[PDB]
Design an enzyme around this catalytic site. Structure first.
Site, short mmCIF file in Angstrom:
data_model
loop_
_atom_site.label_atom_id
_atom_site.label_comp_id
_atom_site.label_asym_id
_atom_site.label_seq_id
_atom_site.Cartn_x
_atom_site.Cartn_y
_atom_site.Cartn_z
N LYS B 34 0.86 -1.17 0.00
CA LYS B 34 0.00 0.00 0.00
C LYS B 34 0.90 1.23 0.00
O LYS B 34 1.74 1.39 0.89
CB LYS B 34 -0.94 -0.01 1.22
N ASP B 62 -3.34 4.29 -1.68
CA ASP B 62 -4.18 4.70 -0.57
C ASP B 62 -4.37 6.21 -0.55
O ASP B 62 -3.69 6.91 0.20
CB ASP B 62 -3.54 4.27 0.74
N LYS B 64 -7.40 7.85 -0.22
CA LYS B 64 -8.60 8.27 0.49
C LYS B 64 -9.42 9.30 -0.29
O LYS B 64 -9.81 10.36 0.23
CB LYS B 64 -8.28 8.71 1.92
N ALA B 66 -11.82 11.70 -1.83
CA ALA B 66 -12.91 12.31 -1.09
C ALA B 66 -13.36 13.65 -1.66
O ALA B 66 -13.61 14.60 -0.91
CB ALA B 66 -12.49 12.50 0.35
N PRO B 69 -17.58 14.33 -7.75
CA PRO B 69 -17.40 13.31 -8.79
C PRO B 69 -16.40 13.69 -9.90
O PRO B 69 -15.59 12.85 -10.30
CB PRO B 69 -18.83 13.11 -9.34
N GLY B 179 -4.29 -3.13 17.24
CA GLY B 179 -5.03 -4.26 16.72
C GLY B 179 -4.21 -5.54 16.76
O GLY B 179 -2.97 -5.51 16.73
N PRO B 181 -3.27 -9.06 14.85
CA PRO B 181 -3.28 -9.72 13.54
C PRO B 181 -4.21 -10.93 13.45
O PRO B 181 -5.05 -10.99 12.54
CB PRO B 181 -1.82 -10.14 13.35
N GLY B 182 -4.09 -11.87 14.38
CA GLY B 182 -4.93 -13.06 14.38
C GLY B 182 -6.42 -12.80 14.52
O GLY B 182 -7.23 -13.35 13.77
O1 BMP Z 1 -8.77 3.56 9.07
C1 BMP Z 1 -7.65 3.57 8.57
C2 BMP Z 1 -7.49 3.62 7.18
C3 BMP Z 1 -6.22 3.61 6.70
O2 BMP Z 1 -6.06 3.62 5.36
N1 BMP Z 1 -5.15 3.59 7.55
C4 BMP Z 1 -3.80 3.57 6.97
O3 BMP Z 1 -3.21 2.31 7.26
C5 BMP Z 1 -1.81 2.49 7.61
C6 BMP Z 1 -1.58 1.99 9.01
O4 BMP Z 1 -0.20 2.05 9.33
P1 BMP Z 1 0.32 1.59 10.76
O5 BMP Z 1 0.39 0.00 10.72
O6 BMP Z 1 1.77 2.22 10.89
O7 BMP Z 1 -0.55 2.12 11.83
C7 BMP Z 1 -1.49 3.96 7.38
O8 BMP Z 1 -0.99 4.15 6.05
C8 BMP Z 1 -2.85 4.64 7.51
O9 BMP Z 1 -2.95 5.84 6.77
C9 BMP Z 1 -5.32 3.53 8.89
O10 BMP Z 1 -4.37 3.48 9.67
N2 BMP Z 1 -6.57 3.53 9.37
#
Ligand code: BMP
Ligand code: BMP
Lengths: 219, 218
Positions: B34, B62, B64, B66, B69, B179, B181-182
Site C-alpha cells: 500500500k 491509498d 482516500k 474524497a 465526482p 489491533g 493480527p490473528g
Molecule cells: O482507518 C484507517 C485507514 C487507513 O487507510 N489507515 C492507513 O493504514 C496504515 C496503518 O499504518 P500503521 O500499521 O503504521 O498504523 C497507514 O498508512 C494509515 O494511513 C489507517 O491506519 N486507518
C-alpha cells in the site's frame, strides 16, 4: 486573513503542465490566489507548486482534502508545506484528532489549515450534510480560522457563516459550472473558488473579467 | 485478489532510498504494497512504477479519495496512469463520488476499495454512525472491495456481515495502533501493517514474526 484579489480563487484542475501554466498566466492580472489539487499534482508532481511560485505572484492553497488518521495527516501536511504550499484543505469528517494533527503541523510550520465542513455536490446530502453543523462547531472549538463551504447551497452556506462567525475566513466552490451564483455566494463567503468556468473558456481572461464585473459592487 | 501471507505492507516512509531498502528487505514475505500520500507527495508518482520494476508487487494507492465526482474522476485517472492496481476511496462524500471512481477503474482494469469505517479514535465522532449505511451503499453500487478497522473487531465483523463472505476486506490498525493480527483475520482477508514493520529495528524479523503468529491462518 489572506488578502484574495478580487475575491476570486482559480481552481487550477487542468492536468497538463503546459495548459495549467498558460491559463494561469493569462488570468494573472485578475487573481493572486490559486487552488492546486490532486488532478494537477498527481499528473505533474509537487514541483508544480514551485513552478507556479516562480512564474506567478500567487498564493498557493493545496486542495488535498486531507482525510486520514492523525499520524498520516501529519506527514501529508509536512510534505505539502515543505513543497511551498501556503495553506492546505482538510476534511473534518474523520474527527477532531485528525484535524488537530493538521493544525499542529501548520502551527509548527507557520502555514494555514482550511477546514472543509460541507460539500457542493449532490452526494454531499447522504452523510456530510447531517454532520456539517457539528463539524463546523468542532472546527470553532479547535481554533480553526479558515473554512470551506458550498456555493450551490446558499442556505447551508449562510448557516456555516453563522457558526464560524464574521471574523473567520470562508471560501466557496460551486459557482459557474456547478450552478452556484457568484453574487449570492459572496453574501456569505469571503472569496469564491472558480475552476471550469474559467479554465475551459475559449478566453479564460475574458471569463475571469466577466465574473469580476458581475460582482464589482462587492469588491 | 490474492495477497501473499494475508499481509499488506503500508509503506509510509517518506524517503525513496529507505522505502525501497525496507520493501526489499521484506519482499520474500509480501507481494502487495500500500503506497500512500506520505511517500508519493515526497518522492513523486514515478515511485509506483519503480516498485513494480523492482518487486513486481501489486500496488494499492491509498489516496482516500474524497472529492466531488468530476475531481474524483481526474484523481483516479492520474493514479491509474501511474500504474496503481487499486485505489482507496472514502464513502462519506456519497454515492456519486464513489461511482465516479468505479467508472474509471472499470475503464482502466483496476479496483476500487471503499473505506467504510476508520481505525483511529476520531472515527467515533462522525464516521462510525454512518458506517453501516456506507457499507450498504457499497453493496448497492456493486463495490466488492472494502476497508475496515483492526482496532474495532466488533465493527469489522459487522462490516463483514453486511458485505458478505464473497467480498474482499482489508484492515489497518494491527500492531502500532493496537489491533491484533490473528483476531483481525477472523474477519478481514488481509491485514495492513506499517510501523510495526517499517520502523522495527529489523523489519524482516518483524514481518516474519507477524507471519509466524498467524501461520495457522495461512
Ligand atoms: O482507518 C484507517 C485507514 C487507513 O487507510 N489507515 C492507513 O493504514 C496504515 C496503518 O499504518 P500503521 O500499521 O503504521 O498504523 C497507514 O498508512 C494509515 O494511513 C489507517 O491506519 N486507518
Ligand atoms: O465541496 C467542494 C469542495 C471542493 O474543494 N470543490 C473543488 O472546487 C473546485 C470546483 O471547480 P469548478 O468551478 O470546475 O466546479 C474543484 O477543484 C473541486 O474539487 C468542490 O467543487 N466542491
Amino acid at each position: 486573513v489572506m488578502d484574495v484579489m478580487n475575491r476570486l480563487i482559480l481552481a487550477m484542475d487542468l492536468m497538463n503542465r503546459d495548459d495549467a501554466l498558460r491559463v494561469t498566466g493569462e488570468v494573472r492580472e485578475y487573481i493572486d490566489t490559486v487552488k492546486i489539487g490532486y488532478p494537477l499534482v498527481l499528473s505533474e508532481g509537487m514541483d508544480i507548486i514551485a513552478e507556479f511560485r516562480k512564474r506567478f505572484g500567487c498564493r498557493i492553497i493545496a486542495d488535498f482534502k486531507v482525510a486520514d488518521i492523525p499520524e498520516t495527516n501529519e506527514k501529508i501536511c509536512r510534505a505539502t508545506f515543505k513543497a511551498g504550499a501556503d495553506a492546505i484543505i482538510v476534511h473534518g469528517f474523520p474527527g477532531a484528532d485528525s484535524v488537530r494533527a493538521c493544525l499542529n503541523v501548520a502551527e509548527e510550520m507557520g502555514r494555514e489549515v482550511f477546514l472543509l465542513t460541507e460539500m457542493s455536490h449532490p452526494g454531499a446530502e447522504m452523510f456530510i450534510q447531517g454532520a456539517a453543523d457539528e463539524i463546523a462547531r468542532m472546527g470553532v472549538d479547535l481554533g480553526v480560522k479558515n473554512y470551506v463551504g458550498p456555493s450551490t447551497a446558499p442556505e447551508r452556506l449562510s448557516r456555516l457563516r453563522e457558526i464560524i462567525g464574521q471574523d473567520s475566513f470562508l471560501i466557496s466552490p460551486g459557482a459557474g459550472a456547478q450552478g452556484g451564483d457568484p453574487g449570492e455566494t459572496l453574501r456569505f463567503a469571503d472569496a469564491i473558488i472558480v475552476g471550469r468556468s474559467i479554465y475551459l473558456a475559449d478566453n479564460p481572461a475574458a471569463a475571469a473579467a466577466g465574473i469580476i464585473e458581475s460582482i464589482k459592487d462587492l469588491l
